[PDB]
């Protein structure tokens, strides 16, 4: 029996003949799926190897051994390859191809085949593979082995398949079966060149997930990858197809017509009229109809319609035709030569015949000229004798046609050209309005003459059916983007999709706030957020779950009326800010972007103004405030510090920051690390300050900062105690000096342990250089397409610029130059323009960073949250590409306490103040400690002041 | 007054130029990355609200809590902070703000919601006010509002036997006071001056931008079957590139002077961030900063993508 | 600036050029002189910032 199973990761092909190193190209072309239901074929007894189509086109591969497999039969020419004992031949008997005896080299089963069939604009592309090999782990990149322009289509395929005669047994054999339908993988390769996977950016979420990252490991987050829309359906053509109504009782069931001298002329114009009637009555015979198609009536409608009713005889109805002239012709009534009419035919025996007789008709005969068309004469008369001993075929026949004419006037008759669709979201078409939305039921009455309503974004909302009287409300269908919810691949493989404000109910499975989300199950508890998802919701992994964000560390303060409550510990928390401070400068000459060595490229726009000249002059401003950036930030003392030749501390250790005189480049581990992280028509310049300046005036700004403490900036570096300095910033965040001198070695301690946990957290974290890298992206996709947009060659037989001037005359060869040369100018000045946005952000940035450098390095800050989280210290520099990253030490509070404290102690009528310190007791007896830490001393009557007496103070005591 | 949010959206390129045309969506997709460049700056744009918006609101993770019991001695900030009778714990203020306050695109939803952010400034009210500055450097350390206006006060030069003379007579100075800002915002339209005019300012930018699809360009009709109906393809295909550049270009300028305000309103949110830090979660030494003058205290309130303060 | 125009100045379009296509060839500069006040204006509005 057939059996099923999953193709894997077979089917990956170059796409030509092009070669590509070390790129993640992606192309889209007929491609076979991955993870596919393909069949496994058996023969044994039975044999069931029906007929294979080609259908679009057949990846065929063959798990061959002991060469079993010698040929098939193409045919619908037909392409066929025969391999005898000799070597391998290639036919298709116009297409002629000579290769290797590959199929009769051969050089249990000890080797594996590989063959591609690929069959589109007459190219017919094999790849060959032998692979020496329950399937066995291994790989092959497809060759290109040969091309040939067959030019041929064979829409059927065969397998044969190979006995053994003298009794007699068939092998089992097998074969795999798969079709390409065009999509665009992603490829990777190594650092030789070859393939290693790919992956279509169609099959998975995890797929577009990947096509859009570009890079094959991720590391978590909430991605944006495509969008949802509901698709129309049905197509809706409303016309006015009930409303009123068109005269036809006095056309087609009048009692009595007129003669055709005297042929009546009548208006018909604003009813309704249906063409059904006349198909769907059997007599009405006769529907030739001149001028103008009836089947496209549902189209074109004429200016009016007129219905004219007479009466003419038999016989000469066969003498109205074009090319004939005679006395009736010439006489009576001319037909137009462009006659855009309609005619109908139909048998009225009953409505002609009169057993009194008919002699009542008269018509005029003589006429002193010719009659002209559209003409009438009133300025002689012959009685028809008709008997009844006519023919069959020589009765009076009754015909009526209407006729249309074409004027300057509007075609103020035309009728309808249907059904009303309810709650869909589809097309709704009132009398030409198109649109895209739900229709549902509207509580505003308008007025009858008003049929289209609008919201103040002025944009279709209600809308009235003009056949049926309903004001409907039209509201815009679901929209939505499609975001990705996957973690890093090291945590999982599931993916989760998420729709931005659409139901589900136009796609376990869970309805949020956001809409519907699909790949996770909501949970009703609260956890802390890790990726926002949406509208307050976040994910945590304890498989992939959707919550309504918690807002954190839940929480009621335990407020008091009369008790404190201060730290008796603290920690020095240790981050890292990173502040872009420059940006990769560029100068870009205008000509040689555009043309380069194009002598008339260049004479041609040169004159087109001033742009290049503007464009050069705002890029070397750019440039320039870049060079005033780094200046800023780095260079603000003229002075070169270098730390003394003994990298001594004060029992303070930074080996792993300061320039190292071991590397001849004067690089610290943390730069080295940032280094490694961090990743034609272009030009860079380079770095007023190169690294190694950079490096040495962070060297100095750390010796200033340390060595000499704050002063370094307002000029020469005064040599001040590196620990008495700290202690001045504990002062300068309210704590005593005191503090720093009882915890001189222990706080050492926390220092290292935190500026190794910094080191630590730099090189095991691939966001900490998030923003750097970021810009660098900025740059390079911006050259990227700033250099794409000349040389693609798109996939045509030729992108030259002389290509089109061999093809053109030298005239139209110029307008072709004009128009290249002008598009290219405004993608280039759309890119400027980006940089220069870019670049004042990034100049806020930098302004950003030289007061981070001035304020929390150069001096202390006490504004809070500015210089790192909690009261901040002070802070040490280092280089990073374009950049720079700030490292600083915030005293953040921990361990709190209760502490019994007394506003005041009435003593003699005394109320007790202290400057600074809060009276508090551990139980047995009383003292003094600071705002920010519990710090108790001695309560004399030096260390406090009485002020106020004891009735106005809060909490009288006595003791 | 500072306005903190924006109005984010993110542009299909494809569907803003063309719809679901075929025809018009195979022409565009040729032109290149240009609208790739759009998407993804209108992403930064959002990931950068949403990180504005966390930093002016989620400045701390622990998320503090008042208590039913607003025991504040004689300090009532019923229309601050949300009343919990109040069914959706919205301050009246906030009230006050909103009712005052007024295709083809997308507006997505903030990371915190309305809820959300009420309940992020009624976290920070409660640190600020409970437990005083300190719960921005870690725990909100628990303080008493006499004491902690008695560092206040030592912080601009005053001693705390100066406020509990007149601890009674400050509190009903700041109460009519808050009367009196009650008052204001309720009847002053010049009172959200800045909130009302950068939301304006994202209003008629969309409406500009919804416009400028309604701009003809001198063709028949922007719906490419009459221009194909009535027209050479030839000439309707050149005609169709024009009116499709023009529009492209119309957005390319729109998120030019979008990124504008996003650095603007982004330097703007980091000012109030930071006297967020000067302000609520501590006392500035910065002049005309927190306000007009000395500064004592401060009180954040919600604000449609925006903040107001009580200085 | 020519803006590809054979003449950079309206009126002397309006000379050197009859009425049915100098009027087309006045669009292209107008618009390609539009183009040039939005870069006007955005330097502007970013000196401003
Ligand atoms: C304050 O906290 C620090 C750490 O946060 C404490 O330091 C630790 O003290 C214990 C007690 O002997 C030692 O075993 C640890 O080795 C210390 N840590 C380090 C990194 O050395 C300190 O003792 C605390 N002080 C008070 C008064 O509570
Ligand atoms: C400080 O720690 C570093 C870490 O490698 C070590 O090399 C150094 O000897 C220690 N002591 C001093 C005084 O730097
Ligand atoms: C102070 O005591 C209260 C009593 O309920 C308790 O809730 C609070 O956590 C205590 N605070 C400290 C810092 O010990
Ligand atoms: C409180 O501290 C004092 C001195 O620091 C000490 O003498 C006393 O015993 C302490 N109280 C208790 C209950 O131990
Ligand atoms: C404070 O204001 C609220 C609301 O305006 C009012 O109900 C209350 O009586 C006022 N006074 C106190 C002490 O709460």
Not at 646 to 672: A, T
């Amino acid at each position: 029996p057939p059996a099923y199973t999953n193709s894997f990761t077979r089917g990956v092909y170059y796409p030509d003949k092009v070669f590509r190193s070390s790129v993640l190209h992606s192309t889209q072309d007929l491609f076979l799926p991955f993870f596919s239901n393909v069949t496994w074929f058996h023969v044994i007894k039975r044999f069931d190897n029906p007929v294979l189509p080609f259908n679009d086109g057949v990846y065929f591969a063959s798990i061959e051994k002991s060469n079993i497999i010698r040929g098939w039969i193409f045919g619908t020419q037909s392409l066929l390859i025969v391999n005898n004992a000799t070597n391998v031949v290639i036919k298709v008997c116009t297409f002629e191809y000579v290769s290797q005896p590959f199929l009769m080299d051969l050089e249990n089963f000890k080797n594996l085949r590989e063959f591609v069939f690929k069959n589109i604009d007459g190219y017919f592309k094999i790849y060959s593979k032998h692979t020496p090999i329950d399937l066995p782990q291994g790989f092959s990149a497809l060759e290109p082995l040969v091309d040939l322009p067959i030019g041929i289509n064979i829409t059927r395929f065969q397998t044969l398949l190979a006995l053994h005669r003298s009794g007699w047994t068939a092998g089992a054999a097998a074969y795999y079966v798969g079709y390409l339908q065009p999509r665009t993988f992603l490829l990777k390769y190594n650092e030789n060149g070859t393939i290693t996977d790919a992956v279509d950016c169609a099959l998975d979420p995890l797929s577009e997930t990947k096509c859009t990252l570009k890079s094959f490991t991720v590391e978590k987050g909430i991605y944006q990858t495509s969008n949802f829309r509901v698709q129309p359906t049905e197509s809706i053509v409303r016309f006015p197809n009930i409303t009123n109504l068109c005269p036809f009782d006095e056309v087609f069931n009048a009692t009595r017509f007129a003669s055709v001298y005297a042929w009546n002329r009548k208006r018909i114009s604003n009813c309704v009229a249906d063409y059904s009637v006349l198909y769907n009555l059997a007599p009405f015979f006769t529907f030739k109809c001149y001028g103008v198609s009836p089947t496209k009536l549902n189209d074109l409608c004429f200016t009016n319609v007129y219905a004219d009713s007479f009466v003419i005889r038999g016989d000469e109805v066969r003498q109205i035709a074009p090319g004939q002239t005679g006395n009736i012709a010439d006489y009576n009534y001319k037909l137009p030569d462009d006659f855009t009419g309609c005619v109908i035919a139909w048998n009225s025996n009953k409505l002609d015949s009169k057993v009194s007789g008919n002699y009542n008709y008269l018509y005029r005969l003589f006429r002193k000229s010719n009659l002209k068309p559209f003409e009438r004469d009133i300025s002689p008369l012959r009685s028809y004798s008709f008997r009844p001993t006519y023919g069959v075929g020589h009765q009076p026949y009754r015909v009526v046609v209407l006729s249309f004419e074409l004027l300057h006037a509007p075609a103020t008759v035309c009728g309808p050209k249907t059904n009303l669709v309810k709650n869909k979201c589809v097309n709704f078409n009132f009398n030409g309005l198109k649109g895209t939305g739900v229709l549902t039921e509207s509580n505003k009455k308008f007025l009858p003459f008003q049929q289209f309503g609008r919201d103040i974004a002025d944009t279709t909302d209600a809308v009235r059916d003009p056949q049926t009287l309903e004001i409907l409300d039209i509201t815009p269908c679901s929209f939505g983007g499609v975001s990705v919810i996957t973690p890093g691949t090291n945590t999982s493989n599931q993916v989760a999709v998420l729709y931005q404000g659409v139901n589900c109910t136009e796609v376990n499975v869970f309805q949020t706030r956001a809409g519907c989300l699909i790949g996770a199950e909501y949970v009703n508890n609260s956890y802390e957020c890790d990726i926002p998802i949406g509208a307050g919701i976040c994910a945590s992994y304890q498989s992939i779950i959707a919550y309504t964000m918690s807002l954190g560390a839940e929480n009621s303060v335990a407020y008091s009326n009369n008790s404190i409550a201060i730290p008796t510990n603290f920690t020095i928390s240790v981050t890292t800010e990173i502040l872009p401070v420059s940006m990769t400068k560029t100068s870009v000459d205008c000509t040689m972007y555009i043309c380069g060595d194009s002598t008339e490229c260049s004479n041609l726009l040169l004159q087109y103004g001033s742009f290049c000249t503007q464009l050069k002059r705002a890029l070397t401003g750019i440039a320039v405030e870049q060079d005033k950036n780094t200046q800023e930030v780095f260079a603000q003392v003229k002075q070169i510090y270098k730390t003394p030749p003994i990298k001594y501390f004060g029992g303070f250790n930074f080996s792993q920051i300061l320039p190292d005189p071991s590397k001849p480049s004067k690089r610290s581990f943390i730069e080295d690390l940032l280094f490694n992280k961090v990743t034609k028509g272009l030009t860079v310049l380079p770095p007023l300050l190169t690294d190694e300046m950079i490096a040495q005036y962070t060297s100095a700004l750390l010796a200033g900062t340390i060595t000499s403490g704050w002063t370094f900036g307002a000029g020469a570096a005064l040599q001040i105690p590196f620990a008495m300095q700290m202690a001045y910033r504990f002062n300068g965040i309210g704590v005593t000096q005191n503090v720093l001198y009882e915890n001189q070695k222990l706080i050492a301690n926390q220092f290292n342990s935190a500026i190794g946990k910094i080191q630590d957290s730099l090189s095991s974290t691939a966001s900490a250089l998030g923003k750097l890298q970021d810009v660098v992206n900025h740059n390079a996709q911006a050259l990227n397409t700033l250099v794409k947009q000349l040389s693609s060659k798109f996939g045509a037989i030729s992108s030259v610029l002389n290509d089109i001037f061999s093809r053109l005359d030298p005239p139209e060869a110029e307008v072709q130059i004009d128009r290249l040369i002008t598009g290219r100018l405004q993608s280039l000045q759309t890119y400027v323009t980006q940089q220069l946005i870019r670049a004042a952000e990034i100049r806020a940035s930098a302004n950003l960073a030289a007061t981070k450098m001035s304020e929390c390095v150069l001096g202390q800050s006490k504004r809070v949250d500015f210089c790192g989280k909690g009261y901040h210290l002070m802070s040490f520099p280092q280089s990073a590409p374009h950049g720079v990253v700030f490292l600083h030490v915030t005293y953040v509070p921990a361990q709190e306490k209760n502490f019994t404290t007394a506003p005041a102690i009435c003593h003699d009528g005394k109320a007790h103040f202290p400057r600074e310190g809060v009276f508090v007791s551990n139980g047995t007896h009383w003292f003094v400690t600071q705002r920010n830490f519990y710090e108790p001393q001695i309560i004399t009557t030096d260390n406090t002041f009485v002020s106020g007496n004891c009735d106005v103070v809060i909490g009288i005591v006595n003791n």
